[PDB]
Ligand binder design. Structure first.
Ligand SMILES: C=C1[C@@H](C)[C@H]2[C@H](Cc3ccccc3)NC(=O)[C@]23[C@H](OC(C)=O)/C=C/[C@@](C)(O)C(=O)[C@@H](C)C/C=C/[C@H]3[C@@H]1O
Ligand SMILES: Nc1ncnc2c1ncn2[C@@H]1O[C@H](COP(=O)(O)OP(=O)(O)OP(=O)(O)O)[C@@H](O)[C@H]1O
Ligand SMILES: [Ca+2]
Ligand SMILES: [Ca+2]
Length: 374
């Protein structure tokens, strides 16, 4: 049916995912980074590379000063963001944007002007024939095969709880929590260095991430777990640096992600992801709360810790009404569920009328995004 393959671009704080609508996985996934040379160029006018994007900026981070154009889920540097999209189209996907409708993602509650800037860049710089900006949380719910539920999305720069009913999101019930994977990696660095090791440099942080994504987990009960670690040596695991040396980690394994439930460990006074989810549900209309409790979906890389689903189930229960059915959904590929939701949506029949056409943009201006998107 579809005359053209739509492109799906999920921009995140740490990783951007890109691909073609219709596919079940994104073709390209790389760091949302843009780097420039630390050292001044000796010659002028010889077209040498000035800016490095994604994996190439990573494979050369040593001689570059890196920038993250997306922080806390919000675009903060539009020149570099433009570079990431240019790189996505021409370097990763090898497509000409003017030949494809492009579906992009953004975080809820983001500045109005960013939504318009995105739309302007897509039409005036890349000349796309059509485009749309959708809320990440919503695509994740869709990828789970649901139109009803509350999504807890936790990435590298931010976390949001987004209540969704019969297909649409409830704007006023959406909550934002400035605590994500980035903060967790830094915290893991800290406590491990207190264990005796020494992780302070940027080159080190990189290995502390693998540890985190592979050795960390969410204890069902923090105190019992801490007790077991202080007496029993059964919760320790091994890890080897790039020097072949092996270093064992103990309670740090579950102490790191515990910050997700007790932000005070990071000096933050915000309430954990369980309380934030509850506060969102209670911000909803009592008539639908029951529905949300039974369809709490996990989305994003930081919700990948083993044991997080069962811990969430336990925490939410103690907060919800006794006779309130609680259920946590943890899709296996929730690391790319937002991209997958986009893939699905872009192919939907009732969604086609939603795309913002070049014609609509030409007649209504940037503000068209608010009417057709939000
Ligand atoms: C993926 C998104 C859009 C496709 C809408 C989607 C429903 C939909 C699906 C197919 C065809 C038409 C409409 N579910 C939503 O929450 C959206 C939908 O947006 C539109 C235009 O319906 C919802 C809008 C509101 C006002 O309810 C919002 O919550 C608003 C603040 C944020 C935007 C949400 C939209 C979301 O980004
Ligand atoms: N197995 C894992 N366990 C815990 N954390 C993980 C795991 N795998 C990846 N992460 C972390 O998830 C984060 C990346 O997730 P994701 O790509 O969803 O975020 P993002 O979209 O780039 O950023 P954001 O959505 O906050 O703007 C990183 O901190 C990564 O280290
Ligand atoms: Ca994201
Ligand atoms: Ca606290």
């Amino acid at each position: 049916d579809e005359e053209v393959a739509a492109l799906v671009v999920d921009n995140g704080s740490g990783m951007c995912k890109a691909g073609f609508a219709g596919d079940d996985a994104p073709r390209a996934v790389f760091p949302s980074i843009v780097g420039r040379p630390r050292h001044q160029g000796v010659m002028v006018g010889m077209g040498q590379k000035d800016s490095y994007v994604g994996d190439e900026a990573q494979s050369k981070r040593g001689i570059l000063t890196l920038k993250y154009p997306i922080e806390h889920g919000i675009v903060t540097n539009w020149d570099d963001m433009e570079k990431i999209w240019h790189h996505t189209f021409y370097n990763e996907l090898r497509v000409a944007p003017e030949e494809h409708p492009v579906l992009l993602t953004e975080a809820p509650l983001n500045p109005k002007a960013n939504r318009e800037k995105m739309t302007q860049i897509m039409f005036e710089t890349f000349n796309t024939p059509a485009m749309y900006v959708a809320i990440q949380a919503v695509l994740s719910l869709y990828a789970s095969g649901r139109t009803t539920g509350i999504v807890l999305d936790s990435g590298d720069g931010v976390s949001h709880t987004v209540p969704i009913y019969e297909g649409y999101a409830l704007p006023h019930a959406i909550l934002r929590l400035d605590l994500a994977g980035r903060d967790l990696t830094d915290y893991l660095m800290k406590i491990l260095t207190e264990r005796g090791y020494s992780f302070t440099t940027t080159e080190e942080r990189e290995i502390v991430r693998d540890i985190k994504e592979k050795l960390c987990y969410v204890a069902l009960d923090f105190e019992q777990e801490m007790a077991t670690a202080a007496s029993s040596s059964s919760l320790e695991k091994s890890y080897e640096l790039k020097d072949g040396q092996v270093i064992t980690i103990g309670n740090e394994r579950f102490r790191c992600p515990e910050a997700l439930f007790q932000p005070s460990f990071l000096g933050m006074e915000a309430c954990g992801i369980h309380e934030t989810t509850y506060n969102s549900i209670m911000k909803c209309d009592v008539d639908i709360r029951k529905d949300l409790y039974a369809n709490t979906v996990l989305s994003g890389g930081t919700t990948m810790y083993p044991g997080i689903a069962d811990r969430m189930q336990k925490e939410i229960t103690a907060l919800a009404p006794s006779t309130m059915k609680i259920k946590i959904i943890a899709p296996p590929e929730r690391k790319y569920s937002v991209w997958i939701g986009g893939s699905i949506l872009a192919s939907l029949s009732t969604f086609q009328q939603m795309w913002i056409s070049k014609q609509e943009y030409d007649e209504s201006g940037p503000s068209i995004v608010h009417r057709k998107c939000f």
